[PDB]
Amino acid sequence: PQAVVVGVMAGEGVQIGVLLDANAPVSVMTDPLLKVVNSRLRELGEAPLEATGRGRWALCLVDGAPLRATQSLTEQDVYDGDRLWIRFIADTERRSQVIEHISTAVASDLSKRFARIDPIVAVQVGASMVATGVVLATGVLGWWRWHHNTWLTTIYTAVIGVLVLAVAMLLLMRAKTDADRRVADIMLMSAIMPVTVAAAAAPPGPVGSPQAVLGFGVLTVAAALALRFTGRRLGIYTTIVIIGALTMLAALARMVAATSAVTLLSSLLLICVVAYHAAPALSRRLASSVRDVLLQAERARSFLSGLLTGLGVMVVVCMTSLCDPHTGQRWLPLILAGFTSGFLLLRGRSYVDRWQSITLAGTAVIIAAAVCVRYALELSSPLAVSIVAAILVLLPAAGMAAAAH
Amino acid sequence: KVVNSRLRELGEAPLEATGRGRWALCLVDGAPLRATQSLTEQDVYDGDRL
Amino acid sequence: VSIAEAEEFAQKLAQWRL
């Protein structure tokens, strides 16, 4: 325990293994330590470390934070096998600047800390507004189809779908920089909605199961096609494909023959339960030497995040549709929802990613809250709401308290 | 001997260890100095730390 | 400056001569 071995990082990237005194204060070692790395660099034939103007030599963690000069290496949380970085930090001292006249003073100062609008951002705003505009247009046209079977909805939406996709193609080919790509992607993605309702609205007669088969089908196809030729925005497109696919299976079954919705909902729930365990494998198979490894790593990470999101959306819709405050053993789905939530609530810890872990943890909480709301709207009476309100506030309070306390 | 003698005057315990081995001078990285060569042969000058 | 800082600087300076 009298000494510790650690890796020290030096100029341009050489790592050197050294056995340091575990109890002397850190300020005592930086100078001779610098000599040793320079000696090895000089014998190795590399360029030694050098000072520049005014500054000092400091020893920091790989995060960059310097260690307190007066404390012992054992007094700090540094263990054998860790690594450190030796660095030069320049002097920041300079004269102070004053401006008397408050009008000029406020103008000069305020222009430094905040960013003004520019022509690059101006385009992304317009691009976002056009996307919002068409998703509203499809909404009113779709609402009209719900009361009328005439071709108008498909006729007018079809032309919009063609126009938005046409414009998107030119932007994609003309692109030059990351900013240009962002604008192009936002525009193309906006084409999926008008095209989707354009097909689903074509089959005559009242709306329902028969039209549903077309809608979720063309939707899944378009999302997959965009992902293939674009190869960007992986996570969101992946989510659309999953939710679209599972809905198409349910739509086709209900359209062909189904004894009850409960049967379909129960089937979907079981499919999702097994899908959670397959998700990491699916994500993993879906994916100068350094480029291949990092590309593989980030591509893989993205697919899992999207895959988890798709499953989370389906279970809450299915689960909340299965439970009921009046039908039979009212308590059976309530406790079943609890057991189903427990698995998700506990398993979230197995993944290192922050957003992946948070989405899993969040998926369980929303189901419990949603179930209570359903049981509060229907079977409405002072006892029902009084119980639900107390439950909803105590529920998360206990969860955070158990973790923080 | 003089270091242990001085340590006792400071009230600190003398240098002591157990097991097969030996006592020697080392650099900040733990590398021991050469036992058969002069400090003038090695790169040692006034104010160095060991 | 502290006593430690003074001796640290003094040791660095002690290495050189005309």
Side-chain angles (χ1 to χ4, degrees):
Chain A
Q2 297 185 356
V4 290
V5 178
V6 292
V8 66
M9 302 170 174
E12 211 179 324
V14 71
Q15 293 198 103
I16 309 189
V18 296
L19 183 148
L20 307 184
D21 170 344
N23 285 310
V26 305
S27 55
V28 174
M29 296 187 284
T30 67
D31 176 55
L33 178 60
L34 189 71
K35 299 181 75 189
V36 174
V37 303
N38 272 352
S39 296
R40 301 205 71 81
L41 281 171
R42 284 167 179 164
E43 296 286 20
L44 182 66
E46 292 295 295
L49 277 176
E50 289 191 329
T52 58
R54 288 172 280 110
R56 64 178 171 116
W57 291 110
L59 182 62
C60 299
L61 302 175
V62 297
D63 301 339
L67 281 61
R68 294 188 181 189
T70 56
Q71 293 184 325
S72 295
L73 189 56
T74 297
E75 177 170 26
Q76 282 151 2
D77 300 347
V78 182
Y79 304 93
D80 187 292
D82 292 338
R83 51 184 192 162
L84 300 176
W85 187 8
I86 188 158
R87 176 185 182 213
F88 185 85
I89 57 176
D91 177 20
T92 56
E93 173 179 299
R94 66 192 182 287
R95 73 170 190 97
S96 185
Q97 186 167 53
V98 298
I99 300 178
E100 301 67 40
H101 199 61
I102 200 153
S103 322
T104 307
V106 168
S108 185
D109 171 53
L110 190 61
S111 74
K112 294 184 178 183
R113 292 180 63 225
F114 298 86
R116 56 177 163 280
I117 193 162
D118 64 44
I120 305 182
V121 174
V123 174
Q124 287 180 82
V125 176
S128 190
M129 289 189 177
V130 62
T132 303
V134 67
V135 305
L136 284 168
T138 60
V140 297
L141 291 171
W143 169 80
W144 186 242
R145 180 64 189 83
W146 225 87
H147 292 159
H148 304 279
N149 296 332
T150 54
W151 300 106
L152 180 59
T153 299
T154 188
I155 288 292
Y156 212 86
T157 312
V159 53
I160 289 168
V162 167
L163 288 163
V164 177
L165 191 148
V167 174
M169 216 71 193
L170 278 75
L171 293 170
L172 283 161
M173 292 292 97
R174 196 173 180 268
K176 303 291 186 174
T177 68
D178 293 344
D180 308 306
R181 283 187 277 269
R182 279 189 179 282
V183 177
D185 301 339
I186 295 159
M187 190 71 76
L188 171 63
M189 177 170 169
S190 190
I192 294 168
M193 299 198 181
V195 171
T196 297
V197 309
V207 63
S209 312
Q211 294 87 3
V213 172
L214 286 78
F216 298 106
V218 300
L219 174 58
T220 306
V221 168
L225 181 63
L227 174 58
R228 171 58 186 271
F229 284 87
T230 314
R232 301 183 293 96
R233 321 302 170 203
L234 279 57
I236 188 153
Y237 291 124
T238 291
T239 307
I240 300 296
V241 171
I242 296 152
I243 69 191
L246 270 62
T247 309
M248 184 182 69
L249 297 176
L252 181 60
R254 181 63 169 149
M255 190 278 290
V256 175
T259 188
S260 79
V262 179
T263 304
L264 276 64
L265 289 168
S266 301
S267 304
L268 287 163
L269 179 56
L270 291 172
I271 291 160
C272 299
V273 166
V274 300
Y276 271 105
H277 297 78
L282 265 74
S283 178
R284 186 158 57 245
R285 65 164 59 230
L286 279 164
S288 304
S289 182
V290 179
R291 289 171 63 255
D292 188 32
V293 180
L294 299 186
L295 288 169
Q296 184 181 27
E298 76 169 34
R299 285 169 67 234
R301 174 178 173 262
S302 305
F303 286 118
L304 176 58
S305 312
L307 181 52
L308 284 172
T309 306
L311 298 177
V313 172
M314 297 308 300
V315 295
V316 63
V317 174
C318 300
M319 185 67 69
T320 56
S321 302
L322 285 164
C323 60
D324 190 272
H326 303 154
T327 310
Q329 296 303 286
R330 293 149 60 252
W331 64 265
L332 179 61
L334 170 67
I335 190 62
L336 179 60
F339 289 130
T340 304
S341 303
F343 164 65
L344 296 167
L345 182 61
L346 293 173
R347 185 52 59 104
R349 73 194 67 212
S350 300
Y351 310 103
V352 174
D353 181 275
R354 177 160 60 189
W355 289 112
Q356 292 168 8
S357 54
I358 290 166
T359 183
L360 279 166
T363 303
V365 177
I366 187 170
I367 296 164
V371 169
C372 295
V373 168
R374 170 71 195 295
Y375 280 58
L377 263 59
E378 296 191 315
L379 190 56
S380 57
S381 279
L383 283 76
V385 63
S386 176
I387 291 163
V388 164
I391 284 169
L392 193 53
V393 63
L394 267 53
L395 168 67
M400 181 176 70
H405 197 226
Chain B
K1 190 174 65 177
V2 300
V3 168
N4 283 349
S5 179
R6 194 273 167 286
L7 279 164
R8 294 169 183 135
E9 299 197 313
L10 190 59
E12 297 301 335
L15 291 168
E16 63 191 356
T18 56
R20 299 186 301 106
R22 63 184 173 86
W23 295 101
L25 283 64
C26 298
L27 304 182
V28 69
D29 66 350
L33 279 74
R34 293 178 181 162
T36 60
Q37 304 192 336
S38 314
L39 288 173
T40 311
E41 282 172 287
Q42 169 55 346
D43 297 337
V44 169
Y45 291 110
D46 275 349
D48 279 322
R49 281 196 290 265
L50 300 175
Chain C
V1 303
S2 76
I3 297 176
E5 289 172 317
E7 202 180 8
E8 170 50 23
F9 169 78
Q11 281 160 105
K12 267 162 173 156
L13 198 73
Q15 175 178 137
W16 302 99
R17 62 171 172 83
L18 308 181

PDB file of all heavy atoms in Angstrom, chain A residues 120-144:
ATOM      1  N   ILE A 120     -28.503  30.577 -42.057  1.00  0.00           N
ATOM      2  CA  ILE A 120     -28.460  29.117 -41.948  1.00  0.00           C
ATOM      3  C   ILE A 120     -29.648  28.607 -41.138  1.00  0.00           C
ATOM      4  O   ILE A 120     -30.329  27.658 -41.541  1.00  0.00           O
ATOM      5  CB  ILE A 120     -27.125  28.652 -41.345  1.00  0.00           C
ATOM      6  CG1 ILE A 120     -25.961  29.216 -42.159  1.00  0.00           C
ATOM      7  CG2 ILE A 120     -27.060  27.140 -41.321  1.00  0.00           C
ATOM      8  CD1 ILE A 120     -24.601  28.786 -41.676  1.00  0.00           C
ATOM      9  N   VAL A 121     -29.906  29.217 -39.985  1.00  0.00           N
ATOM     10  CA  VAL A 121     -31.037  28.844 -39.136  1.00  0.00           C
ATOM     11  C   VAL A 121     -32.361  29.247 -39.771  1.00  0.00           C
ATOM     12  O   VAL A 121     -33.371  28.555 -39.610  1.00  0.00           O
ATOM     13  CB  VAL A 121     -30.884  29.481 -37.750  1.00  0.00           C
ATOM     14  CG1 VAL A 121     -32.107  29.214 -36.923  1.00  0.00           C
ATOM     15  CG2 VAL A 121     -29.655  28.941 -37.065  1.00  0.00           C
ATOM     16  N   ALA A 122     -32.396  30.375 -40.467  1.00  0.00           N
ATOM     17  CA  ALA A 122     -33.623  30.836 -41.111  1.00  0.00           C
ATOM     18  C   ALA A 122     -34.286  29.748 -41.957  1.00  0.00           C
ATOM     19  O   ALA A 122     -35.512  29.619 -41.958  1.00  0.00           O
ATOM     20  CB  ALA A 122     -33.312  32.051 -41.979  1.00  0.00           C
ATOM     21  N   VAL A 123     -33.491  28.952 -42.671  1.00  0.00           N
ATOM     22  CA  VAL A 123     -34.003  27.863 -43.512  1.00  0.00           C
ATOM     23  C   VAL A 123     -34.608  26.723 -42.688  1.00  0.00           C
ATOM     24  O   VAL A 123     -35.685  26.220 -43.021  1.00  0.00           O
ATOM     25  CB  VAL A 123     -32.893  27.356 -44.443  1.00  0.00           C
ATOM     26  CG1 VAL A 123     -33.358  26.145 -45.209  1.00  0.00           C
ATOM     27  CG2 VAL A 123     -32.494  28.443 -45.400  1.00  0.00           C
ATOM     28  N   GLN A 124     -33.947  26.295 -41.611  1.00  0.00           N
ATOM     29  CA  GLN A 124     -34.484  25.211 -40.783  1.00  0.00           C
ATOM     30  C   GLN A 124     -35.828  25.580 -40.167  1.00  0.00           C
ATOM     31  O   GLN A 124     -36.670  24.700 -39.969  1.00  0.00           O
ATOM     32  CB  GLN A 124     -33.491  24.801 -39.701  1.00  0.00           C
ATOM     33  CG  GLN A 124     -32.314  24.037 -40.255  1.00  0.00           C
ATOM     34  CD  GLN A 124     -31.325  23.618 -39.195  1.00  0.00           C
ATOM     35  OE1 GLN A 124     -31.512  22.613 -38.512  1.00  0.00           O
ATOM     36  NE2 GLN A 124     -30.248  24.372 -39.067  1.00  0.00           N
ATOM     37  N   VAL A 125     -36.049  26.850 -39.851  1.00  0.00           N
ATOM     38  CA  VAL A 125     -37.344  27.282 -39.324  1.00  0.00           C
ATOM     39  C   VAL A 125     -38.419  27.087 -40.389  1.00  0.00           C
ATOM     40  O   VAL A 125     -39.464  26.482 -40.136  1.00  0.00           O
ATOM     41  CB  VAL A 125     -37.275  28.741 -38.847  1.00  0.00           C
ATOM     42  CG1 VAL A 125     -38.642  29.212 -38.401  1.00  0.00           C
ATOM     43  CG2 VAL A 125     -36.279  28.873 -37.720  1.00  0.00           C
ATOM     44  N   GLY A 126     -38.173  27.586 -41.591  1.00  0.00           N
ATOM     45  CA  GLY A 126     -39.133  27.431 -42.675  1.00  0.00           C
ATOM     46  C   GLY A 126     -39.413  25.969 -42.973  1.00  0.00           C
ATOM     47  O   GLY A 126     -40.564  25.571 -43.165  1.00  0.00           O
ATOM     48  N   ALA A 127     -38.367  25.151 -42.987  1.00  0.00           N
ATOM     49  CA  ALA A 127     -38.497  23.713 -43.221  1.00  0.00           C
ATOM     50  C   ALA A 127     -39.377  23.054 -42.164  1.00  0.00           C
ATOM     51  O   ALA A 127     -40.154  22.149 -42.478  1.00  0.00           O
ATOM     52  CB  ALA A 127     -37.121  23.055 -43.246  1.00  0.00           C
ATOM     53  N   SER A 128     -39.245  23.460 -40.909  1.00  0.00           N
ATOM     54  CA  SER A 128     -40.100  22.918 -39.854  1.00  0.00           C
ATOM     55  C   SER A 128     -41.546  23.385 -39.999  1.00  0.00           C
ATOM     56  O   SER A 128     -42.475  22.634 -39.687  1.00  0.00           O
ATOM     57  CB  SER A 128     -39.565  23.314 -38.485  1.00  0.00           C
ATOM     58  OG  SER A 128     -40.244  22.600 -37.476  1.00  0.00           O
ATOM     59  N   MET A 129     -41.762  24.629 -40.417  1.00  0.00           N
ATOM     60  CA  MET A 129     -43.120  25.142 -40.615  1.00  0.00           C
ATOM     61  C   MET A 129     -43.848  24.444 -41.763  1.00  0.00           C
ATOM     62  O   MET A 129     -45.042  24.157 -41.643  1.00  0.00           O
ATOM     63  CB  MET A 129     -43.097  26.652 -40.819  1.00  0.00           C
ATOM     64  CG  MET A 129     -42.755  27.375 -39.527  1.00  0.00           C
ATOM     65  SD  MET A 129     -42.928  29.157 -39.545  1.00  0.00           S
ATOM     66  CE  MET A 129     -42.526  29.485 -37.839  1.00  0.00           C
ATOM     67  N   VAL A 130     -43.171  24.161 -42.876  1.00  0.00           N
ATOM     68  CA  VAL A 130     -43.829  23.451 -43.980  1.00  0.00           C
ATOM     69  C   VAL A 130     -44.210  22.032 -43.572  1.00  0.00           C
ATOM     70  O   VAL A 130     -45.250  21.517 -43.990  1.00  0.00           O
ATOM     71  CB  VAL A 130     -42.947  23.443 -45.238  1.00  0.00           C
ATOM     72  CG1 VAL A 130     -41.662  22.718 -44.984  1.00  0.00           C
ATOM     73  CG2 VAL A 130     -43.692  22.791 -46.379  1.00  0.00           C
ATOM     74  N   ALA A 131     -43.379  21.371 -42.778  1.00  0.00           N
ATOM     75  CA  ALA A 131     -43.723  20.044 -42.271  1.00  0.00           C
ATOM     76  C   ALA A 131     -44.964  20.098 -41.386  1.00  0.00           C
ATOM     77  O   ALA A 131     -45.850  19.247 -41.494  1.00  0.00           O
ATOM     78  CB  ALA A 131     -42.546  19.453 -41.503  1.00  0.00           C
ATOM     79  N   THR A 132     -45.037  21.082 -40.499  1.00  0.00           N
ATOM     80  CA  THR A 132     -46.206  21.255 -39.640  1.00  0.00           C
ATOM     81  C   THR A 132     -47.448  21.580 -40.458  1.00  0.00           C
ATOM     82  O   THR A 132     -48.557  21.156 -40.117  1.00  0.00           O
ATOM     83  CB  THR A 132     -45.956  22.362 -38.623  1.00  0.00           C
ATOM     84  OG1 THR A 132     -44.794  22.052 -37.849  1.00  0.00           O
ATOM     85  CG2 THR A 132     -47.148  22.496 -37.696  1.00  0.00           C
ATOM     86  N   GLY A 133     -47.285  22.362 -41.514  1.00  0.00           N
ATOM     87  CA  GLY A 133     -48.406  22.735 -42.367  1.00  0.00           C
ATOM     88  C   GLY A 133     -49.123  21.565 -43.024  1.00  0.00           C
ATOM     89  O   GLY A 133     -50.353  21.488 -42.998  1.00  0.00           O
ATOM     90  N   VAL A 134     -48.376  20.644 -43.629  1.00  0.00           N
ATOM     91  CA  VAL A 134     -48.989  19.494 -44.301  1.00  0.00           C
ATOM     92  C   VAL A 134     -49.574  18.476 -43.322  1.00  0.00           C
ATOM     93  O   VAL A 134     -50.597  17.857 -43.625  1.00  0.00           O
ATOM     94  CB  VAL A 134     -47.987  18.828 -45.253  1.00  0.00           C
ATOM     95  CG1 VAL A 134     -46.867  18.189 -44.485  1.00  0.00           C
ATOM     96  CG2 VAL A 134     -48.703  17.809 -46.104  1.00  0.00           C
ATOM     97  N   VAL A 135     -48.965  18.258 -42.155  1.00  0.00           N
ATOM     98  CA  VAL A 135     -49.598  17.321 -41.218  1.00  0.00           C
ATOM     99  C   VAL A 135     -50.942  17.847 -40.716  1.00  0.00           C
ATOM    100  O   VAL A 135     -51.765  17.062 -40.241  1.00  0.00           O
ATOM    101  CB  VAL A 135     -48.679  16.964 -40.038  1.00  0.00           C
ATOM    102  CG1 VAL A 135     -47.354  16.425 -40.552  1.00  0.00           C
ATOM    103  CG2 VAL A 135     -48.470  18.146 -39.132  1.00  0.00           C
ATOM    104  N   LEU A 136     -51.171  19.153 -40.778  1.00  0.00           N
ATOM    105  CA  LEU A 136     -52.481  19.731 -40.470  1.00  0.00           C
ATOM    106  C   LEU A 136     -53.441  19.541 -41.642  1.00  0.00           C
ATOM    107  O   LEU A 136     -54.624  19.253 -41.441  1.00  0.00           O
ATOM    108  CB  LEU A 136     -52.366  21.213 -40.114  1.00  0.00           C
ATOM    109  CG  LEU A 136     -51.825  21.579 -38.740  1.00  0.00           C
ATOM    110  CD1 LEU A 136     -51.517  23.044 -38.693  1.00  0.00           C
ATOM    111  CD2 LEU A 136     -52.856  21.236 -37.694  1.00  0.00           C
ATOM    112  N   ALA A 137     -52.941  19.706 -42.864  1.00  0.00           N
ATOM    113  CA  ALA A 137     -53.741  19.524 -44.074  1.00  0.00           C
ATOM    114  C   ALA A 137     -54.301  18.106 -44.165  1.00  0.00           C
ATOM    115  O   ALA A 137     -55.483  17.915 -44.468  1.00  0.00           O
ATOM    116  CB  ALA A 137     -52.895  19.848 -45.301  1.00  0.00           C
ATOM    117  N   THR A 138     -53.471  17.102 -43.910  1.00  0.00           N
ATOM    118  CA  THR A 138     -53.921  15.711 -43.926  1.00  0.00           C
ATOM    119  C   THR A 138     -54.955  15.447 -42.836  1.00  0.00           C
ATOM    120  O   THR A 138     -55.870  14.642 -43.030  1.00  0.00           O
ATOM    121  CB  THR A 138     -52.738  14.770 -43.733  1.00  0.00           C
ATOM    122  OG1 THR A 138     -52.112  15.053 -42.481  1.00  0.00           O
ATOM    123  CG2 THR A 138     -51.718  14.962 -44.831  1.00  0.00           C
ATOM    124  N   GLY A 139     -54.825  16.121 -41.696  1.00  0.00           N
ATOM    125  CA  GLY A 139     -55.779  15.966 -40.604  1.00  0.00           C
ATOM    126  C   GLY A 139     -57.204  16.345 -40.977  1.00  0.00           C
ATOM    127  O   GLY A 139     -58.142  15.590 -40.719  1.00  0.00           O
ATOM    128  N   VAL A 140     -57.396  17.515 -41.580  1.00  0.00           N
ATOM    129  CA  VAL A 140     -58.745  17.909 -41.980  1.00  0.00           C
ATOM    130  C   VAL A 140     -59.245  17.036 -43.128  1.00  0.00           C
ATOM    131  O   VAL A 140     -60.428  16.684 -43.173  1.00  0.00           O
ATOM    132  CB  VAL A 140     -58.790  19.401 -42.344  1.00  0.00           C
ATOM    133  CG1 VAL A 140     -58.454  20.247 -41.136  1.00  0.00           C
ATOM    134  CG2 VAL A 140     -57.852  19.710 -43.492  1.00  0.00           C
ATOM    135  N   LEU A 141     -58.375  16.667 -44.063  1.00  0.00           N
ATOM    136  CA  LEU A 141     -58.805  15.816 -45.177  1.00  0.00           C
ATOM    137  C   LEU A 141     -59.187  14.425 -44.669  1.00  0.00           C
ATOM    138  O   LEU A 141     -60.169  13.834 -45.130  1.00  0.00           O
ATOM    139  CB  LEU A 141     -57.723  15.739 -46.253  1.00  0.00           C
ATOM    140  CG  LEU A 141     -57.505  17.044 -47.022  1.00  0.00           C
ATOM    141  CD1 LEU A 141     -56.282  16.957 -47.918  1.00  0.00           C
ATOM    142  CD2 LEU A 141     -58.739  17.400 -47.834  1.00  0.00           C
ATOM    143  N   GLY A 142     -58.440  13.913 -43.695  1.00  0.00           N
ATOM    144  CA  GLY A 142     -58.752  12.621 -43.100  1.00  0.00           C
ATOM    145  C   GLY A 142     -60.060  12.669 -42.329  1.00  0.00           C
ATOM    146  O   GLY A 142     -60.890  11.764 -42.436  1.00  0.00           O
ATOM    147  N   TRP A 143     -60.264  13.726 -41.553  1.00  0.00           N
ATOM    148  CA  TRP A 143     -61.510  13.905 -40.818  1.00  0.00           C
ATOM    149  C   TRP A 143     -62.709  13.921 -41.758  1.00  0.00           C
ATOM    150  O   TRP A 143     -63.793  13.461 -41.386  1.00  0.00           O
ATOM    151  CB  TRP A 143     -61.431  15.211 -40.027  1.00  0.00           C
ATOM    152  CG  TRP A 143     -62.710  15.686 -39.405  1.00  0.00           C
ATOM    153  CD1 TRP A 143     -63.278  15.250 -38.247  1.00  0.00           C
ATOM    154  CD2 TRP A 143     -63.587  16.687 -39.926  1.00  0.00           C
ATOM    155  NE1 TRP A 143     -64.446  15.929 -38.006  1.00  0.00           N
ATOM    156  CE2 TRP A 143     -64.657  16.815 -39.027  1.00  0.00           C
ATOM    157  CE3 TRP A 143     -63.564  17.495 -41.064  1.00  0.00           C
ATOM    158  CZ2 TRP A 143     -65.697  17.713 -39.231  1.00  0.00           C
ATOM    159  CZ3 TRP A 143     -64.600  18.375 -41.269  1.00  0.00           C
ATOM    160  CH2 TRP A 143     -65.645  18.486 -40.354  1.00  0.00           C
ATOM    161  N   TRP A 144     -62.546  14.445 -42.962  1.00  0.00           N
ATOM    162  CA  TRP A 144     -63.641  14.469 -43.928  1.00  0.00           C
ATOM    163  C   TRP A 144     -63.990  13.055 -44.411  1.00  0.00           C
ATOM    164  O   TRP A 144     -65.171  12.719 -44.549  1.00  0.00           O
ATOM    165  CB  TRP A 144     -63.227  15.407 -45.059  1.00  0.00           C
ATOM    166  CG  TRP A 144     -64.209  15.741 -46.133  1.00  0.00           C
ATOM    167  CD1 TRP A 144     -64.081  15.460 -47.455  1.00  0.00           C
ATOM    168  CD2 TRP A 144     -65.429  16.471 -45.995  1.00  0.00           C
ATOM    169  NE1 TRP A 144     -65.157  15.941 -48.148  1.00  0.00           N
ATOM    170  CE2 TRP A 144     -66.000  16.568 -47.273  1.00  0.00           C
ATOM    171  CE3 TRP A 144     -66.104  17.033 -44.914  1.00  0.00           C
ATOM    172  CZ2 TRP A 144     -67.206  17.207 -47.502  1.00  0.00           C
ATOM    173  CZ3 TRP A 144     -67.304  17.663 -45.143  1.00  0.00           C
ATOM    174  CH2 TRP A 144     -67.841  17.750 -46.426  1.00  0.00           C
TER     175      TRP A 144
END
